[model samples]
Target: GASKLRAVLEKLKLSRDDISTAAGMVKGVVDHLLLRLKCDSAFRGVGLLNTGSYYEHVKISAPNEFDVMFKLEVPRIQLEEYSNTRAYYFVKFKRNPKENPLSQFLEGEILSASKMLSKFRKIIKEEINDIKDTDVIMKRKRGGSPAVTLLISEKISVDITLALESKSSWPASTQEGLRIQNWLSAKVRKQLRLKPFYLVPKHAFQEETWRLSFSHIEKEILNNHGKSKTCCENKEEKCCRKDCLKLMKYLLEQLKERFKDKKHLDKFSSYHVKTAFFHVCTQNPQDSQWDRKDLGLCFDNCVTYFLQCLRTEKLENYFIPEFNLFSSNLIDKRSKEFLTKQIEYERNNEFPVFDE
Candidate 1:
C-alpha cells in the first residue's frame, strides 16, 4: 500500500500555485462583493474567511472547488428556535438603533434568511459577470440551500456563504460538546471557547434560520492537531493524523464515484468524513498511535471506525448533537453495508480505490 498509496497521494495532491490561484479567485469574488455592496448598510463591516477543504489543507486533486464564508458582525441579536426538530432559528434584533444597519432586511423584527440570501443573490448576479473571468457562470440557487454557487471554466465551483457572526455565549446544544480537553490541553479548549462563532444563512427544514458555525474552531484544532508543539514542524517527523484524514476524504469520494448510480450514498459528504475523523482522534488520543510509518494501520483503523458509525447510522454533528448528520433515510442498512464492503475491499486489497 505504501508505494501505490504514495503515488496516489502525489497524483491527487494540488500544487502550491493551484491552491493559491483558487484562493485568489475566492478572495477576488469576496472583495468585489464587499466593495460593490458597501453602500448597502446591511453589507457594512462584512468580513470574509475561507472555511472549506482548501483552507483546511485537505483538498484533493485539483483545487477547483472553494467555500468562503462572508461574515456580517451582529452586535445585538437574538436567535429563537423556528422548528422543534431542527436547528433552524428566527433572528431578531434584540435592542438596536431604529436606524440599525441590518434592520432594513428584517421582516416583522425577524431577519428572514430567504430575504437576506435573495438580496445577496441579486448582488452576486449583478457583480459576478464583472469578476474578470468571463468563464465563471453563476449557478441557479438550490432550494433550502445557504450558498450562492458559481462555476468556473465549467470544471470548478465556488460556494460563497453569507453568515452572521455572533459573539454571544454559545447555544445550550454545545454546552457539553467539543470534549477535546483530553486530547488538546484544557487551556486550548478554553481559548477556543472564547472565540466567536458564526450563524450561516442555511437550514433544511425551515426558512430564515441561523445555525451555529464551528469553522473557526475546526481550523484551529486541525491546524494544531498535535499532542506536542513540534508535531508537524518542518525539521521534525510528521504525524499521519492529517494524512489519514485526507485519505479518508479521498476514499469517500472514490466510493461515491464508484457507486454513483446508488442514490442512497449521495447524501454522504466531506463533513461526515471530517466529523468521523474527530471521533477517531478522540478515541485514539495519543500521537504515537498515529506514527507516520504506521499510516497504513492508522488509515485502516480510521476506515473501520467510520464503517462502524455508518452501520449504526449515528454520526453526530461534531458541534451540534441535535443535528444527526446520518439521520437521513438514505443511509440505510444496505447502504451502510455497501460502504463497509468497499472499505473492506480496499483494506484487504491494498486500497485499489486509490489508483482508480
Candidate 2:
C-alpha cells in the first residue's frame, strides 16, 4: 500500500528542468512588470514579494500558477475592523499629512482599496500593451479577486496582487493564532511577528476594505518547517513535512478535477488544505513523527485531519483564529458533507482519483 502511494507521489513530483524553465519565464515577466511600475510616479515605492504554493515549494504536478504581491510602502496607519471576521479592515492615515502619491487613492480619511486597485490594474495593462515581442497577456479582471492575472504564452499564469505594506505591529485579531511555540519556538514566532504584514484590496460587503495577508510569514514557516534546525537540511535527518504537504495538495487537486461537475467542491481550495497541514504539524510537533520513511502515513494523517475539518466544517485560519475558513458563509453545510464523503471514500479506498 505504501509502495503504491509512493509511486503516486513520484509521478506527482515536478521535474527539475520543468520547474527551472517555468520559474525563469515567470520571474522574467514579473521583473519587467515591477520595473515598469517602479518608474511610475504613483508606484515608485512599490516592491514585490513572491508568495503562494510555487514560492512556498509545495506546488505539485506543474509550475503553471504563480503569486506575487506588489507591496506599496505606506506611512503610519490606523486600522478599523470592518466586521466580526476581524480579517478585513479600513486603513487610514494616523496623522493627516500633506499631499502624497497615496492621496489620490484615498476616499475621505480611508484608503480606497478599489481606487488603488483600479490604478494598479491600469498600470499593468498599459505596460503589457507597450511591451513589444512579449507573450505576456493581461487577463480580464475576475470578480472578488484582488489579483491582476497575466497569461504567459497561453500556458503559465501569474497572479499579481497589489498590497499595502506596513511595518506596524500585528493586529490583535492574530493574538490567538500562529501557535508554533511547540514546533518553531517562541523566539522564532516573535521574530516572525516583527516582520511587516500586508493588506490586499479584497472586499466584503462591497465596501472599501482590505484583507490582512501574512503570505511572507506563511512562506517563512513552510521553508523552515522543522523542530530542529537540521530537520530537512541534513540528508540523514531529512523530514517529510514538505513531501506530505505536496502529496496532500496533489490529492486535493486530483479530487477537484475528478469532481469538477460537483460545483460544491469548488469551495475547497489549496489554502484550506495548507491551513490543515499547518495545524497537523503543530499537533504533532516532534520531528520523529515526520520521518522520511513514514511519508505515506504522514500524508494519510494530513488527509485525515483535513477530512475531520471538513466533517466539522470548522477549519480556523492558521494566523487568525477568529476567522473560520470553512464557515457556512464561505462553504455551505451540504457542500462540506459532500466533500467529506468524497475524501473519506478516497482515504478508505486507495485514492482512485490519483490512478489516472
Candidate 3:
C-alpha cells in the first residue's frame, strides 16, 4: 500500500533538466529587474534574497513560480507594536538622518509602509515598460499582497517583495518560538537569532504595518534540515524529511485544485504546511525516525500532525507563537472544518486527489 504512494511521489518529482531550465529563466528575469532597480537612486541599495519552495529545493511540479525579496538596509530603528500580536509593528527611525531616501515615507515619525510600497510598485512598472524583447509583464497588484507579481511568457510567475532589513535583536514575541533546540541545537538557534530579520509592507486593521518575516532563516533551516549534520549526505544516511514536506505540499496543492470553487480553502497556504512539517521534525528529531525506507509512514505522520492542528483550529506561526496562523481572523471555523474533512477523506482513501 505504501509503495503505491511512494510511486506517486516519485512521479511528482521534477526532472533535473526541467529544474535547470526553469532556474535559468528565473535568473535571467531577476537579473534584468535588479539592474533596472539598481540604476534608480532610491532603489540603488536594494539587494536580492531568493526565497520560497523553489529556492528551497522542495518545489514540486512545474518550477513556474518564484519568490525573491528586494531588501533595503535600515539603520537604528525602533518598533511600536501594532496590536497585541507582536508579529506586526510600526517602524520608526531612532534618529532622523539627513536627506534619507526614506524620509518622504515617514508619517509622524512612523515609517509609512504603504508609501514605500507604492513607490516601489511604481518603479517596477516603469522599468517593465522600458524593457524590450522580454516576455515579462507586470501583474495587477493583488489586495493585501506585498509582492509585485510579474508574469513571464504567460507561464512563469515571479513575486517580487520589497523588505526593510534590520540588524536589531529579534522581537520579544519570538522568544518563545522556534523550539528547535533538540532538533537543531541551542547554539544553532542562538546564531540564527543573531542574524538580521526583515519587515515587509503589509497592513493590519487597515493600518500600514510592517509584518515581520524570517524567510531567510526559514530557507536556511529547510536546506540544512536534519538532526545529524550528515543526515541526507549519503545513501546510507538518507532521510525522508524533505520528501515528506514535498509530498504534503503537493497534497495541499492538489486538494486546492480539486476544490477550486471553495472560497474557504484560500486561507490555507504552503507556509502552514511547512510550519507543521517543522513542528513534526522537532517532535521526532532523530534521523532514524524518518529513515528513507519508511517514507510513506513518515509522510502519513506529517499529515496526521496537520490534521490534528486543523481539528484544534490552532496552528501557531513557527517563528511567532503568539500569532496563530489558523486564527478566526485568518481562517474561520467553517473553513477549518471543511479542510479537515477533505484532508481526512484523502488520507483514508489513498489520496485520489493526487491521481486526479
Candidate 4:
C-alpha cells in the first residue's frame, strides 16, 4: 500500500514539499468531515493522511432513542414474515460525549455504532406492529382512477469514499460526496427503515496491503492564449487521487505507533487491504489502457478487496475465530475486488513494493 503511494507520487512527480503541505490540509479536512457527521468531539479521531486522501465510508447504524431515525423506520408488514435484517435504512448517530450518550441512549451505555443500530431495529419493530394493527401510513388514491403503486429496486447498498487533500477543490468534492450520501440516506430511508451513515476518524487506517497506480495524470492546461484554463472538473477529474495517496502513507506510518494490539486494527484501520484476487482490475472506468493491472487506484481497489477479505474471515473463519461475522455477505458485486497481485502472494511480501 505504501509503495503504491510512492509509485503514484513518483509518477506524478510529487515533491516532498507537496506531501508535507497536503498532510497539513488533510488534518483540517478530516476534522471538518468528522464533526459535520456529528462524530463525538472528545472521540479519538485517527487518520494517516500523508497524501491527500479523503475518508469516505458507508455503514448501517443500529437505532436508538430520540426518534432521530424515526423518519426511516420500516413498515411492519415486511418483518411479519420474519427476517434477520429488514431492508431498512441504516442510521448510526454517535454522541457528543461531553454531553452524554445516556441522555439519548435507548439501552445501556451506548456501546458502538453497531449497538445503536440494533436498538433502532427493536424500536422500529414496535412501530411497525402498531402500523399493522391500527392506522399507520394513510392510503392514497391516484388521479383518474384508484391505482396501487409500489416500487422496489432490489435492496442495493452503495458506499463510496472520495479522498481529498486541498480545500481549493474541497467544497465540490465534499458537496458531491455528501450529496450522494444524502440522496442514498433519503431514498433508502424514505422507502425502507434506516438511513445511511459513516464513521470518519481524523486518522486514516493501519496495515499494509497492495500497491496502486492511476491511469491518467492531473494537469491544468492553459487555453490557446496560454493564460488559464476556463473549464475544469478539478476534484473528480484531477485532485482526489494525489490527495488520497498521501493519506495512505500517513496512515501506515502512524498506525505503526497507535496500535500495539493487532485487535485494534479491526475497528480502526480497515480501509487499506488487498483482496485474494489478481486478474487485473475492473476495466478502468476512465481509461481502458490502464487495464492489465495489478492494482489501480489504491483507494478504490484496496478497500473493495478489503471488504471481501473481511467477509472470508468472518464467514469462512479465515482468521480470528471469535470475529465470525455471521454471514455478512451483503457486499455487492460492484463492491467486488479489482485489485491484483493475489492477496495471498501479496501478503507474503509482508510489505509489497510498487512493482512485483
For candidate 4, give the lDDT.
0.26
Q: What tens-digit string does per-residue lDDT give for candidate 1 at 1-356?
A: 66666666777664657766766765665666778776676887777754544443222332467676778888887878765644566788787566667766878888888788878888777776665556678876665354677776676677777778888887777777787888887898788888787887766544667777788788777878887867888646588998888888888887888887766577678778889999888788788888888888888788888878877778877777667777644356677677767777777788877764
Model 2 residue runs over 4 Å out of place are 52-63
TM-score of every prediction relative to native: 0.90, 0.94, 0.93, 0.22
Best by TM-score: 2
Candidate order by decreasing lDDT = 2, 3, 1, 4
Alpha carbon RMSD to native, model 4: 21.1
Model 1 misplacement above 4 A: 14-19, 50-63, 96-99, 129-133, 329-334
Model 4 scores worst on lDDT over the 10 consecutive residues at 62-71
Candidate 4 or 2, higher lDDT: 2
> Model 3: per-residue lDDT, tens digit, 55-121?
4322223246666678888877789888686799999888755657778788889998878888888
Would you give me the overall lDDT of model 1? 0.74
Q: Tens-digit lDDT track for model 2 on 247-275?
A: 78877777787787755688788888889
Instruction: Go through the candidates in order and give each one's C-alpha lDDT.
Output: 0.74, 0.82, 0.81, 0.26
Worst 10 residues of 2 by lDDT: 53-62
Name the better of 2 and 4 by TM-score: 2
**Which residue pairs show collisions in model 1?**
113-208
Give candidate 3's total backbone clashes: 0
Error of 2 at 99 (Å): 3.8
